[PDB]
Design a protein around this ligand. Structure first.
Ligand SMILES: CCCc1cc2c(NCCc3ccc(OCc4nnn[nH]4)cc3)nc(OC)nc2s1
Ligand SMILES: *[C@@H]1O[C@H](CO)[C@@H](O)[C@H](O)[C@H]1NC(C)=O
Ligand SMILES: *[C@@H]1O[C@H](CO)[C@@H](O)[C@H](O)[C@H]1NC(C)=O
Ligand SMILES: N[C@@H](CCC(=O)O)C(=O)O
Ligand SMILES: N[C@@H](CCC(=O)O)C(=O)O
Lengths: 764, 760
């Protein structure tokens, strides 16, 4: 209901938010001590400085008609009728501390052609000159704050965040640009909330809970007014929640937002417009008292709110503004600039429109607002008022009547104890953060907070993206034989190889075979050596005593061939344990049959000659034995011609199983040669059953039959053991040896023990 | 720049979109015919009918001051300055069509206390009476169309959808409400697009292409103004793109939107406010011609545009010959005018009781009184109503209407037409028979979803909070799925049913009686049993024969019996296991071996060296009963049971096994081994004299052979403990061979000398 009026030739209107938006019962409550009173005193100070300037409007004195908007658009629009009710007359309006108020006032003012310059309105909608064609401002739009915030988020690897925004033209227009800029930097948003004009504490707690619903998103982005930010921070403190805040210029660097909720706000990052303090305004504002500053109608209420006193008790005289500290507001410069800009415009008009006189002129009595705005408002160019030493600034408007984009970045920190605000880098055309000043980001404290949906998969895991969400992937493990060729897919190697340590490689593994130094090779080798030594000893004994009647009673040539066969029977253990080659496989295929053929042929001839006792000479006997041996050899030669002498490396469903080196298919030759021997054995047994006759010095073929029986029992009992363990061929070939050696040892003991018994125990 | 003025005692304002929005070049474009001239003539007709009624304002003549908004808010406000310049006087303002114009005008009018009633304005923001405290309307808000659309997009199963909006209050608020309602029902928005105030053809084509980038969403939900819809349809026709359109009342049922783009628009579904046609208005409009309708300044431009003629050969045409199609919202305009008239009549009756002409008290009408006590409390029969209807005019606490809607489809008959298929008041009802593609035998319904349904055997896993999309995953071949999200184990020894929800205990397994591995011995055992029966019969018959007389005992008959029992035991090993079968196997094996070796223990003892016909039998029976004692004690200690086996890589493989472990048998075999070491020892000590027919060296040979067999067999058993099939085959073969050795080695010479060569 109050208005500030100062007489002058030309009157400039003003609009400031002196009072905060009251509650339901009352339209307007408490006073704004920083964004209200100080800005108004700045405008008054600029007017006073202009009115004693000889170079700027020497003969024209500027008046003022200042109103209060009370942070509400309807109240501001109701008050704004005073500017247009005259058509005293108002040339232009320096106003706007909010975007809704500015838009509503511009919509009304454009119908009467009244220029308007704003000092704090940063909405992008106002750059459309087809809708708002009477408007200028000294601040940049919100097109660049979204870019700055997106780059700040991208710097710290924050890819999963949450946006809280306010309702109107500042909050939604800013968040749409932030969402576009996030899209252009591969970022992703989880949830979105909005705050209404009328909101209670319970709804704020609901917003906090909705933010807490997603635990992975620990970063909250705010495009909010100061009151909404204060209430949200208070609610978060009450509910004991912890977030890392990134806020717009609504929070700025105000101390009232974080008053009483210091614990919740610590570690936040905020953006503010770049500015400097003015030295004259401090000395001007620190000399004001209610008994001299009569022209301001809202000063006494501010005095009572500030110093907590009352003029009724006559106790407010002691207090003074000098003793208490002074913290100048950020946008004061902008306010001063706006006023000076308008002044300069009018000066140029007065210089061009009528150069004859210095006072006002009959042509310029009713000022034209189209000419003034279109020609002179947008073409102003001067040096900034009260500029700090060694710094250069300038006052200009773009095509859209907007300012220049420069911002400063602040953190809230806990001192060594009171809380203060510090610069952490500029932002002009690209970020320039200095990470040393932020406490939460020096590495002594800990690693930087995290805001990702899903953690990075391991080198052995692969990524399969879930449809509908880029930021979140599910890790998977590859088969143990599989290597990871690319980030989102892995393949398997060709059989015979194994993944590299880095798992981006294929490597041929260790070919495995039985080795000489193994105990499983040592044992059979020792047994074979002992058998060979025993055979040599028996041969040496028979040779040494070759003239005794008992030795002469038996054949000597057949004894020698049988001893040689026994020796070959033993040597095969050693042949069959040797590393496979081009020659060793041939010996493995040959010697088994050769040994059986030699031994069984010797037995056959011995029984044949005893049974017959034609062609009984020691040479007919040698010929028959050699023919019987050569028969088996014929088959081996044929097999060598029929099949291929070679080897093979295999694999099995269990791919881990190493590629063993084995000989080629040996089915037909071995089994057939089996016949070259088992049939011969059967004939020998038959002739032994027929040799029971004509007893010789011995002719106890009861021993040869027993030998054959024991051999059949032996081998025939290896067949169950084999299938039992068809794997581990290295241990598989630890039965063929130990059966062949046993058969040979049975034959040797059977044939030689009675003769040695006679040789030793009796003279005969 | 032109104004329509009619004199009267009281004046009502008006605001209609007579002209379409012009381009960058000019302020005002071509004339708008349906939401223009028709509505303006409806208002004029309502005023003239009110100005000749016995019961409503009999002594006061109402005037009019009607302006043009040209589809722009800035132009509408510049024109609306005329209403407040008096502060002639304006009693009320029958206001905007589009929501932006209404909001802009209301912001200015609330300052001077001038009531306003709108038509066709459906924005939700206007329901907030803290800001627009002088605004009323006869149409419901946009809070219910979102519900209607979300239920049409759920009757048919659509879940990946796209949205297109117009910049401004109407489109943005509507899309926000629709998104909330869709989330509430599990409907998910694929992509979101916006249309600006000034958009070129390339921008519309870009919007179409952006819609065409995600290809599962084939349904587009438009909540936009009519001109944007027309331009988007033209762009879609040019680029040969096909979608299913769901539109709000901005499209409505206008023929202008679908002029020349019939192919792209076919099959669309739109929503319109519920209304009826008035019959007096048709003849009123159809009777107009430019020579007598001189009070309307915009009529000649409409005539020129409509009939394509120039007044500078215009009299040949007539409006009666052409068909007439009434616009949907004529009733609402008539209702608004009548509501204002009734409010003024009631106020006049309250304040000027003794006169019919205006009195001095009402001379400057008080806006705040008329609106707070008379406008919101009107109630009357809706005028020009159908013969059997009950529509009434009233306002709620927010000055709103009742929410009822109709639903239309666009089809080809060869002319095209709109067809009504249902309505929405509080619950959705629609007839799918009238829709061509929704009718049966036409084919499957158009589909739009993130993921197709999972297979029977598969399970879906999704990220948390992902309510629409689903990622299917195959469960393991041996797992029972608890619910769609998570598969689980079914149970050891069980396999999942065919339906993948049931589970069934696997069948057991035991040797099939026809496997050749087991068949081979059943035959060997039969042959051995036949031989034992033969030998027993021959020796039983010829007891008189001297070969029987020479040895003189019955341990031979015992031994034979034992041999027969050993073969019957090898019959009983290859059998279906049970408790009794386990006991029989665990008794008979030891019994048969101990019997045979005890017998030959007797004969070796007897020939080693009081020897009596009963002492030898007593020793044999004592050794047998000793073995029976041991086996019975060990069977009492370990109760016989049956079990089922399973293991780490068992893959549908079940088994039946005896509860007794293999190693527990070992003790009995140890016993028998010692027995053998004794029999052999004695057979070694008596290796010289042939007491009768050389019957000692044959006994020695038999002892050695049995020792060889046991030495060969024992490790094969331990090595083959791993595999059961080979174990049973080897056990059967070894036992059968061990019996055959004793038989053939000992009983062959006696049979040969008795039968083949009788010489005793
Ligand atoms: C009563 C009858 C006694 C006889 C037995 C007998 C016999 N038996 C051994 C047969 C056999 C077994 C497994 C093998 O797989 C193992 C392997 N092989 N190469 N690498 N690993 C290979 C061969 N071979 C032959 O000479 C051919 N003569 C005879 S006389
Ligand atoms: C952000 O991510 C990049 C990508 O690896 C990394 O190099 C950079 O260090 C991250 N930022 C910080 C502050 O660690
Ligand atoms: C939509 O899904 C429900 C759920 O199974 C189903 O009952 C209904 O039939 C579906 N709609 C149509 C048109 O089939
Ligand atoms: N930039 C803020 C104004 C805040 C202030 O007055 O400091 C807005 O446009 O909403
Ligand atoms: N109901 C639409 C206008 C559509 C019409 O003109 O009928 C709105 O609120 O903007």
């Amino acid at each position: 209901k109050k208005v500030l009026t100062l007489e002058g030739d030309l009157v400039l209107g003003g609009l400031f938010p002196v009072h905060q938006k009251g509650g339901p019962a009352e339209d307007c409550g408490p006073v704004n001590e920083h964004r209200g009173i100080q800005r108004l005193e700045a405008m008054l100070f600029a007017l006073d400085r202009i009115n004693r300037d000889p170079h700027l409007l020497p003969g024209v004195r500027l008046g003022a008609h200042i109103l209060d908007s009370c942070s509400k658009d309807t109240h501001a629009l109701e008050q704004a009728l005073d500017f247009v009710r005259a058509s005293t007359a108002i040339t232009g309006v320096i106003g706007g501390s909010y975007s809704d108020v500015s838009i509503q006032v511009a919509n009304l003012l454009r119908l009467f052609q009244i220029p308007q310059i704003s000092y704090a309105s940063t909405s992008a909608k106002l750059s459309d000159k087809s809708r708002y064609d009477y408007f200028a401002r000294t601040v940049p739009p919100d097109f660049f704050q979204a870019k700055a915030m997106a780059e700040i988020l991208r710097f710290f690897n924050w890819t999963y965040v949450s946006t809280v925004a306010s309702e109107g033209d500042y909050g939604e227009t800013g968040i749409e640009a932030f969402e576009l800029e996030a899209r252009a930097r591969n970022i992703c948003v989880a949830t979105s909330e909005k705050v209404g004009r009328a909101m209670s504490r319970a709804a704020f707690e609901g917003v906090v809970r909705a933010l807490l619903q997603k635990p992975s998103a620990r970063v909250a982005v705010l495009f909010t007014r100061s009151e909404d930010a204060r209430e949200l921070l208070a609610a978060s403190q009450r509910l004991n929640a912890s977030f890392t805040w990134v806020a717009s210029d609504g929070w700025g660097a105000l101390e009232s937002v974080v008053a009483g909720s210091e614990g919740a706000a610590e570690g936040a990052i905020t953006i503010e417009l770049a500015s400097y303090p003015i030295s004259d305004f401090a000395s001007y504002f620190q000399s004001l008292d209610p008994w001299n500053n009569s022209r301001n109608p809202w000063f006494r209420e501010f005095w009572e709110q500030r110093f907590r006193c009352s003029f009724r008790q006559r106790d407010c005289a002691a207090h003074s503004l000098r003793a208490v500290p002074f913290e100048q507001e950020s946008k004061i410069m902008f306010v001063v600039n706006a006023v000076y800009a308008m002044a300069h415009a009018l000066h140029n008009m007065h210089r061009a429109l009528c150069p004859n006189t210095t006072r006002l002129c009959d042509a310029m009595r009713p000022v034209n607002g189209r000419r003034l705005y279109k020609d002179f408002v947008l073409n102003v160019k001067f040096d900034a008022p009260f500029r700090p030493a060694d710094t250069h600034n300038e006052v200009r408007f773009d095509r859209f009547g907007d300012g220049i984009g420069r911002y400063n970045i602040f953190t809230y920190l806990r001192a060594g104890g009171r809380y203060r605000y510090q610069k952490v880098g500029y932002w002009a055309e690209g970020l320039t953060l200095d990470t040393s000043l932020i406490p939460w980001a020096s590495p002594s404290a800990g690693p930087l907070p995290a805001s990702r949906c899903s953690e990075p998969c391991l080198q052995n895991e692969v990524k399969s993206v879930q449809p509908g969400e880029v930021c979140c992937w599910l890790c998977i493990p590859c088969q143990p034989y599989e290597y990871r060729l690319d980030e989102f897919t892995c393949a398997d190697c060709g059989l015979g190889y194994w993944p590299n340590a880095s798992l981006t490689g294929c490597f041929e593994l260790p070919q495995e075979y039985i080795r000489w130094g193994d105990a499983w090779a040592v044992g059979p080798v020792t047994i074979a050596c002992l058998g060979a030594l025993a055979t040599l000893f028996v041969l040496g004994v028979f040779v040494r005593h070759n003239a005794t009647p008992v030795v002469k009673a038996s054949g000597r040539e057949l004894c020698y061939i049988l001893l040689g066969g026994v020796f070959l029977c033993y040597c095969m253990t050693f042949i069959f344990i040797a590393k496979p080659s081009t020659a060793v496989c041939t010996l493995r295929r040959l010697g088994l049959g050769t040994a059986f053929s030699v031994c069984y042929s010797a037995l056959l001839t011995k029984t044949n000659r005893i049974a017959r006792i034609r062609f009984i000479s020691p040479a007919s006997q040698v010929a028959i034995c050699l023919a019987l041996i050569s028969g088996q050899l014929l088959i081996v030669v044929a097999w060598l011609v029929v099949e291929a002498p070679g080897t093979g490396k295999e694999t099995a469903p269990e791919r881990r199983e190493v590629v063993t080196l084995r000989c080629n298919h040996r089915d037909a030759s071995m089994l057939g040669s089996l016949a070259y021997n088992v049939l011969l054995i059967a004939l020998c047994t038959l002739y032994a059953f027929k040799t029971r006759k004509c007893p010789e010095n011995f002719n106890e073929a009861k021993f040869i039959g027993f030998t054959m029986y024991t051999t059949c029992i032996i081998w025939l009992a290896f067949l169950p053991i084999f299938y039992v363990t068809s794997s581990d061929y290295r241990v598989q070939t630890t039965t063929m040896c130990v059966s062949v050696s046993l058969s040979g040892s049975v034959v040797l003991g059977c044939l030689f023990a009675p003769k040695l018994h006679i040789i030793l125990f009796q003279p005969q």
